[PDB]
Amino acid sequence: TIYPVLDWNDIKFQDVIGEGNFGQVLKARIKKDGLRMDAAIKRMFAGELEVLCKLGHHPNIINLLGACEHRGYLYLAIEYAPHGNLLDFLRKSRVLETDPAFAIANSTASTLSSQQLLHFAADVARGMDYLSQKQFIHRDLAARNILVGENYVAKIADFGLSRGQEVYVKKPVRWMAIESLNYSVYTTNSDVWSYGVLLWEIVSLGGTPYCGMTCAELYEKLPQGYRLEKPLNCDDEVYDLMRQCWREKPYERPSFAQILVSLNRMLEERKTYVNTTLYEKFTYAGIDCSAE
Numbered sequence: 193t194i195y196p197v198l199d200w201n202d203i204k205f206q207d208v209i210g211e212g213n214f215g216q217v218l219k220a221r222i223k224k225d226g227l228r229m230d231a232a233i234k235r236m237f238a239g240e241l242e243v244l245c246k247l248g249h250h251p252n253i254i255n256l257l258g259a260c261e262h263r264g265y266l267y268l269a270i271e272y273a274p275h276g277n278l279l280d281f282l283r284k285s286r287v288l289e290t291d292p293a294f295a296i297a298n299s300t301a302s303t304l305s306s307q308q309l310l311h312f313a314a315d316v317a318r319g320m321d322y323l324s325q326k327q328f329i330h331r332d333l334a335a336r337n338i339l340v341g342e343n344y345v346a347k348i349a350d351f352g353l354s355r356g357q358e359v360y361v362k363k364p365v366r367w368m369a370i371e372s373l374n375y376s377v378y379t380t381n382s383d384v385w386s387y388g389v390l391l392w393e394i395v396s397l398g399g400t401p402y403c404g405m406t407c408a409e410l411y412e413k414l415p416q417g418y419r420l421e422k423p424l425n426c427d428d429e430v431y432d433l434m435r436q437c438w439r440e441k442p443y444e445r446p447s448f449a450q451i452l453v454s455l456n457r458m459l460e461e462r463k464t465y466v467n468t469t470l471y472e473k474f475t476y477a478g479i480d481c482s483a484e
């Protein structure tokens with residue numbers, strides 16, 4: 193009873209809407225507190241379960257509605273994010289590709305604006321600050337694991353449940369901190385590195401990071417000091433923010449709280465930080481289906 197119990201009989205499964213590291217996610221309708229509502233279902237040890245059930249609501253963390261035991265398996269009922277994962281949401285906005293007529297007429301390269309992209313980044317930083325302050329270590333921060341829920345509020349999903357100052361996970365190379373590629377240990381510091389790549393994904397409207405490069409090249413190239421280049425449509429303040437997230441020394445990277453402050457500053461300025469207008473020779477950052 194450590195969680196809002198739910199009867200498998202009150203779950204109306206619909207369609208498959210995605211798939212995480214473990215299992216498929218299914219959209220469904222359930223009855224909670226006598227009321228019928230939308231939800232995503234994921235088939236999920238004991239300690240982690242309590243960790244999740246205890247977490248506690250936060251507007252930028254996908255929320256647990258209830259769990260259900262069935263055939264020896266535990267099914268989690270999750271708050272529903274109608275808009276889907278951030279990665280596809282970003283790629284669906286590349287109107288120059290999805291609706292060129294619209295793009296030329298409005299002279300825009302995305303249905304989304306600079307502010308919206310900054311909000312997604314701020315939303316995630318807020319959620320990560322909340323999680324890291326409680327010793328949580330995500331381990332797999334990336335656009336694909338961010339959900340765009342009600343009112344387009346970004347929500348963090350698929351975060352690791354093993355709490356502590358650092359966690360070893362024997363076992364996503366393009367999002368991993370150098371110290372994780374070498375040691376398989378994760379900390380909030382390596383979460384910050386990944387957040388930086390997430391920020392780069394946001395600004396590039398879902399481009400594959402290090403497009404054109406093999407994982408192998410990264411292993412040797414990253415330690416040499418190599419890092420993702422600034423997208424031409426990105427302001428320097430935003431790019432510097434990413435660079436801070438990728439400092440070789442983990443303890444030199446900012447905290448999520450500091451990241452959020454820098455983002456809120458940008459959000460407050462009338463200034464535009466991520467250019468989405470169409471300029472003479474515009475092209476999107478590439479998506480390497482060979483790596484995905």
Ligand SMILES: CC(C)n1c2ccc([C@@H]3CCCCO3)cc2c2c3c(c4c(c21)CCc1nn(C)cc1-4)C(=O)N=C3
Binds near residue numbers: 210271276336339
């Ligand atoms: C593949 C990933 C991105 N996956 C998840 C992966 C992991 C979780 C867990 C639940 C327990 C707390 C930590 O995190 C939730 C989701 C998760 C959710 C939802 C979705 C997806 C999820 C992907 C496919 C999808 N399409 N649409 C329209 C919504 C979703 C959703 O609505 N509520 C939760």
